[PDB]
Design a protein around this ligand. Structure first.
Ligand SMILES: CC/C=C\C/C=C\C/C=C\C/C=C\C=C\[C@H](O)CCCC(=O)O
Length: 256
């Protein structure tokens, strides 16, 4: 019955709204311009300092540290959303951790796209907007830190997916039965099968005129992996040239 799939889709979308304060709908509203949600833009040094005063230690590293914090924040959000996925908490505690460890970043960059356009990205819950040109001008090796993300966002945002779609998709990402070290693989794949069935109906009903979106979308998981890898490298480079820089223990744990 497809009525069981629609019901599953609604459960997931409902938890998605409850687990993420800044949705794509809100982001897009802000990005396309209103008066109350008009963001402050940061494109240079002055505006940066000006922003630290209106939005609420060298520029590059100080900024990068913000990224860390935010990432940790997102993880917490994703972790809580994972629990609402039917069957997920019923799995071996070890596997629950495995799926989270690997799936967390691919989900961070997927949702990050919602906050990006070709010229920049929203920060601090939509309160601010930092230009891609500023980030790209940062000091090596932090200048080439965000470029891969912007590249993906532009390509991915072209699918024109909305929140209700993204919720089933990140559910599928988490429930991947091919993660390194999964003890009990079968029960996991059984859940993804169902999720995939929800995403397939969801997309067809929500994007009737959009040919083979389901396939196009599933392909993007390829781009996501690439993004994660490149990051791990660069991240390992910062480690050596910046031995005086911290790293949240939760993030260090995920990269082993
Ligand atoms: C208060 C905000 C200050 C600086 C943030 C500026 C840009 C953040 C925009 C996107 C980053 C969001 C999440 C994380 C992105 C990075 O890719 C994570 C880097 C840390 C890591 O994952 O190892």
């Amino acid at each position: 019955e497809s009525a069981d799939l629609r019901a599953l889709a609604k459960h997931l979308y409902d938890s998605y709204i409850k687990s993420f304060p800044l949705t794509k709908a809100k982001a897009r509203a802000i990005l396309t311009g209103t008066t109350d949600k008009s963001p402050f833009v940061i494109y240079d040094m002055n505006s940066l300092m000006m922003g630290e005063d209106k939005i609420k230690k060298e520029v590059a590293i100080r900024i990068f540290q913000g990224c860390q914090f935010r990432s940790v924040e997102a993880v917490q959000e994703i972790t809580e959303y994972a629990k609402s996925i039917p069957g997920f908490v019923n799995l071996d505690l070890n596997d629950q951790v495995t799926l989270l460890k690997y799936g967390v970043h691919e989900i961070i960059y997927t949702m990050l796209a919602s906050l990006m356009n070709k010229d920049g990205v929203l920060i601090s819950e939509g309160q601010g907007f930092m230009t891609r040109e500023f980030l790209k001008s940062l000091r090596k090796p932090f200048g080439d830190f965000m470029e891969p993300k912007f590249e993906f966002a532009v390509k991915f945002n072209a699918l024109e997916l909305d929140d209700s779609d993204l919720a089933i998709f990140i559910a599928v990402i988490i429930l991947s039965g091919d993660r390194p070290g999964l003890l009990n693989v079968k029960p996991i794949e059984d859940i993804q099968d169902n999720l995939l069935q929800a995403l397939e109906l969801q997309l067809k009903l929500n994007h009737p005129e959009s040919s083979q979106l389901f396939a196009k979308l599933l392909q993007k998981m390829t781009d996501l992996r690439q993004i994660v890898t490149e990051h791990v490298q660069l991240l390992q480079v910062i480690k050596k040239t910046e031995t005086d820089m911290s790293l949240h223990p939760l993030l260090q744990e995920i990269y082993k």
